[PDB]
Amino acid sequence: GWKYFKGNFYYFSLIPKTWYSAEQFCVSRNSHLTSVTSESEQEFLYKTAGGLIYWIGLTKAGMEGDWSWVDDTPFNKVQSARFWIPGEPNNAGNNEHCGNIKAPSLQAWNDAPCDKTFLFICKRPYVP
Ligand SMILES: OC[C@H]1O[C@H](O)[C@@H](O)[C@@H](O)[C@@H]1O
Ligand SMILES: [Ca+2]
């Protein structure tokens, strides 16, 4: 059921999980919750998501609470600015330390509580 895009396979889950249980599921399939590092990847993801909300690999790191990617892709604050839903990350209720794809737009990301359950997207490198 994995979908292929530019050197990576992607798994769009059928069952919802908390952010961490999702990441664990990805790790069990030799993958990680997806990073997003280009306009074309954002576009591939939100179109495939079809208007439903999916956990991606966005999570906070460091004392400053900077955003990071669980797959260890360095997070680029400048290049990622265009990918958030206007108003996000808003840190609602001071408890939104993980990120999902929510809106079917390039401006797609929302921060939400890590313990909420959503469908999720795994990303696995293809290695010829
Ligand atoms: O109003 C926007 C707000 O809606 C809900 O409260 C949650 O999804 C938050 O993550 C989001 O910031
Ligand atoms: Ca939010």
Residue numbers in the entry: 198 to 325
According to the publication:
Electron density for both sugars in the disaccharide is seen in two copies of the CRD, whereas only a single-mannose residue is observed in the other two. One orientation is the same as that observed for the terminal mannose residue in the Man4 and Man5 structures, in which the 3-OH group coordinates Ca2+ and forms hydrogen bonds with Glu293 and Asn307, the 4-OH group coordinates Ca2+ and forms hydrogen bonds with Glu285 and Asn287, and the 2-OH group forms a hydrogen bond with Lys299. When the full disaccharide is visible in this orientation, the residue at the nonreducing end is in the primary binding site, and the 4-C of the mannose residue at the reducing end packs against Ala289. In the second orientation, the sugar ring is rotated about an axis perpendicular to the C3–C4 bond, so that the partners of the 3-OH and 4-OH groups are reversed, and the oxygen attached to the anomeric carbon forms a hydrogen bond with Lys299. In this orientation, when the disaccharide is visible, the reducing end residue is the one ligated to Ca2+, and the second residue does not contact the protein. In the first conformation, the chain can be readily extended from the reducing end. At the other end of the disaccharide, glycans in which the 6 position of the mannose bound at the Ca2+ site is on the reducing side of an α1–6-linked sugar can also be accommodated, since the 6-OH group of this mannose points away from the protein surface. In the alternative conformation, the 6 position of the nonreducing mannose is away from the protein surface, allowing elongation from this end, and an α1–3 linkage of the Ca2+-ligated mannose to GalNAc, as in polysaccharide 44, could also be accommodated.
Langerin has an extracellular region that contains (1) a C-type carbohydrate-recognition domain (CRD) that binds sugars and (2) a neck region that mediates the formation of trimers. As in other C-type lectins, the CRD of langerin contains a conserved Ca2+ binding site that binds to carbohydrates.
